[PDB]
From a paper:
[name] folds the chromosome of [name] and related bacteria. The [name] protein [name] dimerizes at its ‘‘hinge’’ domain, which connects via the long coiled-coil ‘‘arm’’ to the ABC-type ATPase ‘‘head’’ domain. The heads are bridged by the kleisin [name], whereby the C-terminal winged-helix domain (cWHD) of [name] binds the ‘‘cap’’ surface of one [name], and the N-terminal middle domain (MD) binds the coiled-coil ‘‘neck’’ of the other [name]. [name] also recruits the dimeric KITE protein [name].
[name] is an obligate dimer, formed by two MukB2E2F monomers held together by their MDs and [name] N-terminal winged-helix domains (nWHDs). Focused sub-classification of the particle images revealed a DNA-bound structure. The DNA was captured directly at the open gate, while the proteins adopted a conformation virtually identical to the open-gate state. DNA-binding surfaces were largely contributed by [name] and [name], and to a lesser extent by the root of the ν-[name] neck. The DNA was not entrapped inside the complex but bound at its periphery without contacting the top surface of the heads. As the captured DNA is positioned at the open neck gate but not entrapped, we reason that entrapment may be achieved by ingestion through the gate. We propose that the DNA-bound structure obtained here represents this capture state. Starting with the ATP- and DNA-bound capture state, we envision that upon ATP hydrolysis, the [name] subunits revert to their apo conformation. [name] is now free to sample the space around the DNA, and as its straightened neck is competent to bind the MD of [name], the neck gate will eventually close. This results in an overall rotation of [name] that wraps [name] around the DNA and generates the holding state with DNA entrapped inside. Transition from the capture state to the holding state retains a short DNA segment at the center of the [name] dimer.
Residue numbers in the entry:
A (entry chain C): 1 to 294
B (entry chain D): 1 to 147
Write the structure that this text describes.
DNA sequence: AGGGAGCTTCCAGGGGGAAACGCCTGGTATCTTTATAGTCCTGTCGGG
């Protein structure tokens, strides 16, 4: 079953019928981030209503807002976050009516995008690739050992769906992070050339070389592991075809192979785009420096 | 270094200075989801400007909207998504000026929350604990080996 | 030991005083509506 069981028209009809939307102005986003920071400093991962109100007061202070109606504004903000599926509220009779709050997977993902300083680490990728290689190798050995529907579900499907797929998604996010980093560097090089292009030549060459080395090192690492990961996916596919198959395992393996191809292809494409820019900046600098001679 | 290097007041000041905000109306959110779906069906994880415009046209049809200025409306929506950090645009001289688009980690996280049907699994938890147990065991053996 | 009356102590009853609760009025926040003005597009025509 395609992760997205619905076609574009069906999804559009479904979204339209459920009236989904998200509204996080700077203050609300700051409050969410403050809640995320406060939750990370705690031992129980739970926040009371009073603690959330204190956090809202700090945001309001930070925005230099009137102390009038702050308890009301905090309640409206808390209700808005719950209504927007950012917070889960637990109302227990045992807690004398005091509600307990926890951030939802959505509220966490959003807050982390802004607060977590995510930079591309080669070590991280090498580690992730190591875990997926071991998980795929175990799943391939389990598929080759053969077994019943319970064995194929517990030792092959579960590791592919609940472990390998997650790791591949994490790698794809790391690539999308790298993509944002490249666009940021292009803006910095243009600024350096507008301030003092003569002194900026060494700094621009450093930024171009550091980015190029990183992209290449990454691609080298993906290519080295990619062949072993594909071989293990093929071993699982061959073992599945030999044991009468399972349409669920075949589709899952096909999806993982498609993601792996996307992950490998992205690196080469990013290198070509960076090379085009690098050549252009070098040509520009040479034209600016060397061709005027007086 | 705490994952969140900044205290709450510092973060609030930083957020205020950078002016970060999210506004996701039904139509734009539907367009984002349509883009996310279209990207998942592709082999290269890349979308051209014409393909994004075709996707917007389908959303507009699904919302029963006027076919007038759809190309403009689509450009406004695409620029809004890029301006909101949901899409990364690549403009290469080699591509004769044709821009290539990819969804940002943010645009993906948001689209997946709505489209991905997420339900809890013990098998998954058992596998995750097994992997972490092996990774922690190797790290402990490496720490005990010294170096 | 039983029965009644006196002294002494504690509870019951009265009276005051203010707060709290309940209700209304207006203010403050929030949101919507309405209008205006922009911005861009589209269309037409004419000219090149």
């Amino acid at each position: 079953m395609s992760e997205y069981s619905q076609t574009v028209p069906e999804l559009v009809s479904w979204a339209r019928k459920n009236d989904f939307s998200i509204s996080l102005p700077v203050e609300r986003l700051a409050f969410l981030m403050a809640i995320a920071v406060l939750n990370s400093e705690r031992l129980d991962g739970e926040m009371s209503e009073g603690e959330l109100i204190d956090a809202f007061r700090e945001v309001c202070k930070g925005f230099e807002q009137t102390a009038e109606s702050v308890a009301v504004r905090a309640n409206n903000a808390i209700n808005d976050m719950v209504r927007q599926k950012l917070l889960n509220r637990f109302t227990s009779e045992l807690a004398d009516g005091n509600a307990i709050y926890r951030l939802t997977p959505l509220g966490i993902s959003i807050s982390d995008y802004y607060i977590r300083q995510r930079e591309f680490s080669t070590l991280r990728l090498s580690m992730q690739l190591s875990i997926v290689a071991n998980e795929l190798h175990r799943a391939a050995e389990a598929a080759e050992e053969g077994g019943d529907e319970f064995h194929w579900h517990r030792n092959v499907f579960a590791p592919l769906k609940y472990s390998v797929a997650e790791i591949f998604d994490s790698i794809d996010m790391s690539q999308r992070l790298m993509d944002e980093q490249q666009n940021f560097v292009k803006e910095d090089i243009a600024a350096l050339l507008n301030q003092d292009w003569q002194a900026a030549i060494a700094n621009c060459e450093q930024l171009l070389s550091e980015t190029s080395g990183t992209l290449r090192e990454l691609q080298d690492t993906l290519e080295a592991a990619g062949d072993k990961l594909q071989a293990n996916l093929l071993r699982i596919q061959d073992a599945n075809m030999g044991s009468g198959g399972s349409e669920l395992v075949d589709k899952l393996v096909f999806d993982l192979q498609s993601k792996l191809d996307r992950i490998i292809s992205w690196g080469q494409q990013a290198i070509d785009l960076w090379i085009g820019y690098d050549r252009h900046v070098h040509k520009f600098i040479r034209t600016a420096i060397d061709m005027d001679k007086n």
